[PDB]
Amino acid sequence: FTSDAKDKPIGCSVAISTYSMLGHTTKRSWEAERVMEWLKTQEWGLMILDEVHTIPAKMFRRVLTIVQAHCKLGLTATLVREDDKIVDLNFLIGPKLYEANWMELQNNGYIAKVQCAEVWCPMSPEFYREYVAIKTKKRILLYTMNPNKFRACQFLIKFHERRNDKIIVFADNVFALKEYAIRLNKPYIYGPTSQGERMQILQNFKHNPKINTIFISKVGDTSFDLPEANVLIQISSHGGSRRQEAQRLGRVLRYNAFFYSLVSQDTQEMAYSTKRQRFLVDQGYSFKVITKLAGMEEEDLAFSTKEEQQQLLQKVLAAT
Amino acid sequence: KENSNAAIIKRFNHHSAMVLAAGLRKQEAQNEQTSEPSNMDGNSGDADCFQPAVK
Amino acid sequence: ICEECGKEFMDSYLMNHFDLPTCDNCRDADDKHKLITKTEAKQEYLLKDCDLEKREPPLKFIVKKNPHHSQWGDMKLYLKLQIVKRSLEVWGSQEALEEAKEVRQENREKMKQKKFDKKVKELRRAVRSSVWKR
Amino acid sequence: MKLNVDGLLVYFPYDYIYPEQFSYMRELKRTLDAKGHGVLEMPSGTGKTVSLLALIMAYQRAYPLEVTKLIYCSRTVPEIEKVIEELRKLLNFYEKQEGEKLPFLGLALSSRKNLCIHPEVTPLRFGKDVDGKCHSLTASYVRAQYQHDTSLPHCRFYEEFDAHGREVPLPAGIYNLDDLKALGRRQGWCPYFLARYSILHANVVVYSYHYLLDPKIADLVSKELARKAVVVFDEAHNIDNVCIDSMSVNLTRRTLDRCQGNLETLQKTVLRAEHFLGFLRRLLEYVKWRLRVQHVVQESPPAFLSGLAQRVCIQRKPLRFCAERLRSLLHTLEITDLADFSPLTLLANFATLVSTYAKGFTIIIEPFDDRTPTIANPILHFSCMDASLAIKPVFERFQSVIITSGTLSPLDIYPKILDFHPVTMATFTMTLARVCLCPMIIGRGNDQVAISSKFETREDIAVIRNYGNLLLEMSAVVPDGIVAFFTSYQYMESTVASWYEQGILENIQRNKLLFIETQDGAETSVALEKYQEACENGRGAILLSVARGKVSEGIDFVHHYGRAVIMFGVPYVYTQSRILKARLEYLRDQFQIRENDFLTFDAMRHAAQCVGRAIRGKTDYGLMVFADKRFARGDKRGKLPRWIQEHLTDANLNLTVDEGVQVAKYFLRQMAQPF
DNA sequence: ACACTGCGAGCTCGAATTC
DNA sequence: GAATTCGAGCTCGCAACAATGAGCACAT
Ligand code: SF4
Ligand SMILES: [Zn+2]
């Protein structure tokens, strides 16, 4: 019931639909109006609500009063969520039945043994001149387009391309996605691309040993068909959400596999990156700290001189 | 003007009936030359007749 | 069996193409109807594809040759009284149809002017970004 | 195995049923109790045959008065022998479960060239000659002087059959074609006339299509057989093309001058009735006069009958008995051979077809030949359009008729072309322990160039290279056999020759040998036995052929013969022939089938039949690429059946050539491992 | 007496942090 | 409490659609 094929949705036995299809608060199409008139008058049994942590929002919790069901199972992966509405979920669905021991499934081989690491980068002296000058939101660009953070992503890509690892570079703040993925000539799922070239970039990444990295931007924050990465270089994601950095971890465990987290030190992003490991340390995950990499100053890393470092400050600060 | 457009379709039917006759050469027992030149004469039976259609 | 003249007849030009019991003696070529094509039933009376084949009773069409193609494809034709009976069934009254067309006919000229301000705000952003910085 | 369908006790001859195959018998029982027809679809050839025969043979035990006879129409003689051998396997299973004998006999019918014992008449090659050499030895004037019992020419098998082969029937024991000759040998009877006599008292009867669909045949073998029977049209995806070619005659100058010789040699025999010879000499003049024109192509299906009475003044009332009296005139003349008079019967069959059948027919005289402005070979076609004028006796005479195949592409076109109303119209899909088929639509090339086999996108080298770069890069990752169907012979010849002038065919011959299927039968069967030998040893072969050819409809590619099946374009017919351009006019007014939607339906049933010829069994896996951009659209990939469409995902929908190999290589690696 | 399948537009949400 | 950034989904309009080849089984 996802409004593209609609394989006779009225009169069936298993209906697989979405949120904001069942709780679409505006005027519906005519094909959707006949199915919602059918779905509102038939009692079900065992609704399955995937991604349970989005139910306590204002729109998605009106679903449970539109459709009548006896049993309501909720399957998720990360139960934590900001704004304190998971205690709200104990009566919308029911009590918490089972929680998987995350260190026990790792020790039995059902989940890849993840080596967490939080490599933090010093700030360039030309960039810290403007980071402490202003407070009004332009400094979010200044810590994600750090030239010394660029050298830690280009080195970590090269360190695993020489080991035939499959790299996913998760990076929000889409201006930093362009100026990272065209200075290394790598494909990127920008977010407003398409449905077509979203697929062909996603499948040459899996069954081809030539394309090795991919630069997603806030798309893989759900249960998508991301094709089994081996490392994950997360660069400057959303602010203080421990839901997201347990969904980026799920891309890795699907030391065998291990993911990174680039942090420009002595900024606001150090406070954020310890608020997002606040959930993963409650599953036994150990987050190392890498201060200096394994010989970063000896390969052909970009942003070497200062004249090529001064141009980036004239590009980032020019936005405003 | 049809003749020069029909003199080419024979000219690589002679060199595409060779590839099956050479494809049996790479295998085992070769094909008899009286049968491979049978349909080739039949394919040339129209091309030579149309050769006088615009001679 | 007919309804306009009530005569008993086996078959006519109608009731095998549109299911309408009307004899072929008068046939009303410019009196009761015309033959409206499919593309005129979408932009004049404003019906989607969920109105000609899903609203009960579903009406059928007549395939014919394309006039300016002659080798390409089809040209569907609908009966004109079946369309204006469907437009009164889908859109309330007849005085709701044209009143809904006024807010729709301005949406294309709204697109004509809103294309001309994003062409201003993008080409001026390429030159203002070079003078705001220092 | 006392398997239970909803009302029966079906004795199944196996141990494991598939969960789709048990639901096949429920829908098959839903036809017979409703006393109506049915359009079913199930992929395999075997397993479908043993499940259909398990229900209906068990159905006539619980209700022996509702159905009595099962007529099984198969395509040709190899499948006739296959169905009978699956029937005695079910019969011998009944012999173990009960320990008894049964009043149950099952036959198989074919031509006189198959059931034949007499030595001077069997080694004749062509089928139309063995009827004549029979007819010189068994006609009612040949046996007229055998009432004296002298040493005149006679068949000893026919003259023995009518004296003793009437009082006793065949007892039991399901008969093949070879078993009927063995019964006729050791008893001394005819095998052909014993099968025709005992076809009225049987329970399963397996013959071809043409004993039931051909109107001038079915009134001779199957007119009085059963008013409460069950007909099964097995593998009837092209059931409409059999119904058109049965009621369509074709006349040319090569046939008509041979009718002048037949009318010459009849004039020498009457002097040794006469108004009938001046009748045909009048009619032969008019058909030659209409072929004498060099003008535009024209069509006139009942207006031929007006102009036949204008210059020639022959009405249509004696023309209906034209083929009737010619069958009687040759009887009273006592002609020895009848294969020589085959053009004059073909002219007389044309005369009795334009007099009665004129609602959805046409007559197309084509003086301008194919592609050439002046070649003196005109030809008139009497082409049938309406494919439901041949099953209208079959849809009415019997109780229930079940049209089953593996590739009925939409299930709603077949009750629209053929004027009937089924009661189920159901489809099915096989269930598997793996995913034994990986369809893919290899669209754009390796440099984002379209691959299509259109008419304007055939002579550019940017497409011929991308076809050559595809067959090269699939012949290095597929083991032991690739079948590459092209769309025509003039396109297969003009692409392999254009791969040889470039450097592409030398790199395919390094991997696999390539064998080409040609129009003649001797070079094809030679090139087919070296193909099946090059897949058994380690060389690996490629059989590149055409789509409406002999290998695409007859040869069944079992596992490790054709692991991949490459469709090099959508196999359309010639869409600008004057016969097809008239049939779509009838298909547009009647039944309102859109003219673009019929060419795709006709093409997706040949592109799914030959692709579906790669999986026959439980352990058979097989690749099936569709190397055309036009396969990707909705009105074409939505036509290929529901057992090859449920595995065609959206990732394998517009794959490029190099990405199509790493779905080919990953699939063949997964399939090679044990269960 | 023209016009199929794809596709960016508004519209309205969400998560989390801002102003 | 009312904005943002970037994501998601569902309606719906917009513009322009296509379709090229070749032969043996069955009746007196
Ligand atoms: S009558 Fe019998 S033996 Fe004679 S040709 Fe016919 S089938 Fe053969
Ligand atoms: Zn009337």
DSSP letters for D158-174: HHHHHHHTTTS---S--
Reported as type and span, the H/E element at residue D622 is strand D622-626
**Spatial strand order in the sheet of D482-486:** D437-440, D622-626, D564-567, D482-486, D541-546, D513-516
Q: What type of residue sits at position A147?
A: P
Distance CA D160, CA D290 (A): 51
Distance CA A237, CA A286 (A): 20
Do residues D161 and D183 lie in contact, with contact meaning Cβ atoms separated by under 8 Å? no
Q: Indicate yes or no: CB of D666 within 8 angstroms of CB of A207.
A: yes
Nearest-atom index, ligand 1, CA of D133: 5
Facing residues of C56 across strands? none
Q: Which two tokens stand for residue D669?
A: 């690696």
Residues sharing a CB contact under 8 Å with residue B31, sequence separation 6 or more, in sequence order = B21, B24, D523, D526
Longest alpha-carbon distance in chain D: 86
Residues in chain B whose Cβ is within 8 Å of chain D: 2, 9, 12-13, 15-17, 19-20, 23-24, 26-28, 31, 35-36, 38-39, 50, 53
> Cis before residue C57, ω within 30 degrees of 0?
yes
CATH architecture for segment(s) D437-672:
3-Layer(aba) Sandwich (3.40)
Distance CA D246, CA D263 (A): 26
Do residues D601 and D661 lie in contact, with contact meaning Cβ atoms separated by under 8 Å? no
For A279, A280, C20, D482, the CA distances from A249, given in Å and listed in that order, are 11, 9, 66, 44
Judged by a CB distance cut-off of 8 A, whether residue D310 touches chain C is: no
Distance CA D308, CA D314 (A): 6
* Minimal CA separation from C52 to chain D, in Å: 16
Longest alpha-carbon distance in chain C: 91
For every residue of D555-615, which 3-state class applies, written as one string? CCCCCCCCCEEEECCCCCCCCCCCCHHHHHHHHHHCCCCCHHHHHHHHHHCCCCCCCHHHC
Strand E lies under 7 A from the Cβ of residue A194: yes
Q: What is the DSSP string of D279-301?
A: HHHHHHHHHHHHHT--S--EE-T
Distance CA A182, CA D482 (A): 42
Nucleotide with minimal C1' distance from the CA of A275 is E16
The verdict on whether residue A28 carries a ligand-binding annotation is: no
- Residue written as token pair 């798309």: A219
The crossing angle, in degrees rounded to 10, of helices D274-291 and D342-351 is 80
The crossing angle, in degrees rounded to 10, of helices D342-351 and D253-270 is 100
Which residue from A67, A82, A63 is spatially nearest to A19, judged by alpha carbons? A63
Smallest CA–C1' distance to F18, residue:
C72
* Minimal CA separation from C59 to chain D, in Å: 13
Which residue from D613, D511, D432 is spatially nearest to D45, judged by alpha carbons? D613
Nucleotide with minimal C1' distance from the CA of D633 is E5
Residue numbers after which chain D breaks, C to N beyond 2.5 angstroms: 272
Contacts of A29 in chain C (CB under 8 A): 50
Residues sharing a CB contact under 8 Å with residue D669, sequence separation 6 or more, in sequence order = none
Burial A196-234 (b: 16+ CB within 10 A, else e): eeeebbbbbbbeeeeeebbbbbbebbeeeebbebbbbbb
Reported as type and span, the H/E element at residue D474 is helix D461-474
Ligand 1 center to residue D157 CA distance, Å?
7
Distance A221 CA to F5 C1' (A): 15
Q: What is the DSSP string of C70-91?
A: SSS-B--EEEHHHHHHHHHHHS
Distance CA D108, CA D205 (A): 6
Of A30, A31, A320, the CB nearest to C132: A320
The CB-based long-range contact list for A82-90 (8 Å cut-off, 24+ gap) reads A82/A240, A82/A241, A82/A243, A85/A56, A86/A53, A86/A56, A88/A56, A89/A52, A89/A55, A89/A56
Say if strands D379-384 and D361-366 run parallel, antiparallel, or are unpaired.
antiparallel
Q: What is the DSSP string of A124-146?
A: PTTTHHHHTT--SSTHHHHHHS-
Distance CA A109, CA A257 (A): 13
Residues sharing a CB contact under 8 Å with residue A247, sequence separation 6 or more, in sequence order = A77, A78, A220, A221, A222
Judged by a CB distance cut-off of 8 A, whether residue D527 touches chain B is: yes
Which residue from A72, A74, A103, A70 is spatially nearest to A86, judged by alpha carbons? A74
Nucleotide with minimal C1' distance from the CA of A224 is F8
Do residues D595 and C74 lie in contact, with contact meaning Cβ atoms separated by under 8 Å? yes
Within 6 A (CB) of ligand 1 lie D 112, 115-118, 121, 134, 137-138, 155, 157-158, 190, 192
Helix, strand, coil share of chain C (percent; to 5) = 40, 5, 55
Of C50, C54, C133, the CB nearest to A317: C133
Q: What type of residue sits at position C46?
A: L
Q: What type of residue sits at position A258?
A: F
Facing residues of D626 across strands? D567
Say if strands A47-50 and D622-626 run parallel, antiparallel, or are unpaired.
unpaired
Do residues C78 and C59 lie in contact, with contact meaning Cβ atoms separated by under 8 Å? yes
* Closest chain D residue to the Cα of C75, Cα to Cα: D594
Running DSSP on this structure, what letter comes out for residue A44? B
Q: Indicate yes or no: CB of C48 within 8 angstroms of CB of A30.
A: yes
* CA end-to-end span of chain C: 88
Do residues D385 and D360 lie in contact, with contact meaning Cβ atoms separated by under 8 Å? yes
Q: Which two tokens stand for residue D642?
A: 């529901």
Distance CA A105, CA A72 (A): 26
* Closest chain B residue to the Cα of D376, Cα to Cα: B53
Which residue from D400, D421, D405 is spatially nearest to D68, judged by alpha carbons? D400
Mutate to test the interface with C, among D419, D595, D598 (most CBs of C within 10 A): D595
Residues 20-79 of C with CB under 7 A from strand E: 34-35, 37-39, 64, 66-69, 74-77
Judged by a CB distance cut-off of 8 A, whether residue D293 touches chain B is: no
Neighbours of chain A (3+ CB pairs under 8 A): C, D
For A54, A148, A190, D344, the CA distances from A172, given in Å and listed in that order, are 20, 18, 10, 85
Q: Which two tokens stand for residue A152?
A: 């830690």
For every residue of D66-106, which 3-state class applies, written as one string? CCCEEEEECCCHHHHHHHHHHHHHHHHHHHHHHCCCCCCCE
Do residues C18 and C82 lie in contact, with contact meaning Cβ atoms separated by under 8 Å? yes
Helix, strand, coil share of chain A (percent; to 5) = 30, 10, 55
Ligand 2 center to residue C46 CA distance, Å?
30
Distance CA D88, CA D173 (A): 8
Helix, strand, coil share of chain D (percent; to 5) = 40, 10, 50
Does D have 3 or more CB contacts under 8 Å with A? yes
Distance CA D278, CA D544 (A): 54
Smallest CA–C1' distance to F4, residue:
A137
Cα D84 to chain centroid distance, Å, stands at 19
Distance CA D109, CA A275 (A): 84
Cα D470 to chain centroid distance, Å, stands at 32
Ligand 2 center to residue C21 CA distance, Å?
7
Report phi then psi at C18, rounded to 5.
-130, -5
Burial (0-12, 13-18, 19+ Cβ within 10 Å), A301? middle
Tell the residue nearest (CA) to atom 2 of ligand 1.
D190
Q: Give the count of beta carbons closer than 10 Å to the beta carbon of residue C126.
A: 8
Burial (0-12, 13-18, 19+ Cβ within 10 Å), D198? middle
Q: What is the CA radius of gyration of chain B?
A: 14
Neighbours of chain D (3+ CB pairs under 8 A): A, B, C
Helix (H, G, I), strand (E, B) or coil at A297: coil
Distance D576 CA to F26 C1' (A): 31
Smallest CA–C1' distance to F27, residue:
D217
Which residue from A240, A278, A231 is spatially nearest to A116, judged by alpha carbons? A231
Q: What is the dihedral of CA D504, D509, D514, D518, to 10 degrees?
A: 50
Nucleotide with minimal C1' distance from the CA of D109 is F26
* Closest chain A residue to the Cα of D650, Cα to Cα: A199
Distance CA C75, CA D445 (A): 34
**Spatial strand order in the sheet of D229-234:** D38-41, D400-405, D229-234, D69-73, D204-207, D106-108
Distance CA D146, CA D163 (A): 14
**Residue to probe by mutation, ligand 1, list D120, D146, D192, D194, most atoms within 8 Å of CB:** D192
The verdict on whether residue A81 carries a ligand-binding annotation is: no
Burial D143-167 (b: 16+ CB within 10 A, else e): beeeeeeeeeebbebbeebeeebee
Helices (H), A88-207: 89-92, 102-107, 128-131, 139-144, 147-161, 175-181, 196-204
Do residues D216 and D308 lie in contact, with contact meaning Cβ atoms separated by under 8 Å? no
Helices (H), A8-146: 30-39, 63-66, 89-92, 102-107, 128-131, 139-144
Distance CA A9, CA A17 (A): 10
Strand ranges (DSSP E) for D203-322? 204-207, 229-234, 249-252, 298-299
Tell the residue nearest (CA) to atom 5 of ligand 1.
D134
Distance CA D530, CA D536 (A): 10
Helix (H, G, I), strand (E, B) or coil at A194: coil
Do residues A139 and A146 lie in contact, with contact meaning Cβ atoms separated by under 8 Å? no
Say if strands D2-3 and D10-11 run parallel, antiparallel, or are unpaired.
antiparallel
Helix (H, G, I), strand (E, B) or coil at A99: coil
Judged by a CB distance cut-off of 8 A, whether residue D538 touches chain B is: no
- Residue written as token pair 């006790």: D9
Nearest-atom index, ligand 1, CA of D157: 3
Q: Which two tokens stand for residue C95?
A: 């005085």
* CA end-to-end span of chain B: 10
Contact positions of strand F to protein Cβ (< 7 A): 5-14, 16-28
Running DSSP on this structure, what letter comes out for residue D401? E
Reported as type and span, the H/E element at residue D318 is none
Which residue from D493, D440, D504 is spatially nearest to D466, judged by alpha carbons? D504
Q: Indicate yes or no: CB of D662 within 8 angstroms of CB of A199.
A: no
Residues sharing a CB contact under 8 Å with residue A309, sequence separation 6 or more, in sequence order = A124, A126, A147, A303
Residues sharing a CB contact under 8 Å with residue A17, sequence separation 6 or more, in sequence order = A1, A2, A9
Sign of CA dihedral A232, A236, A242, A247: negative
Does C have 3 or more CB contacts under 8 Å with B? no
Residues sharing a CB contact under 8 Å with residue A91, sequence separation 6 or more, in sequence order = none
Cα C39 to chain centroid distance, Å, stands at 5
Distance CA C13, CA C33 (A): 13
Distance CA D120, CA D133 (A): 9
Q: What is the CA radius of gyration of chain C?
A: 24
Residues sharing a CB contact under 8 Å with residue A183, sequence separation 6 or more, in sequence order = A150, A302
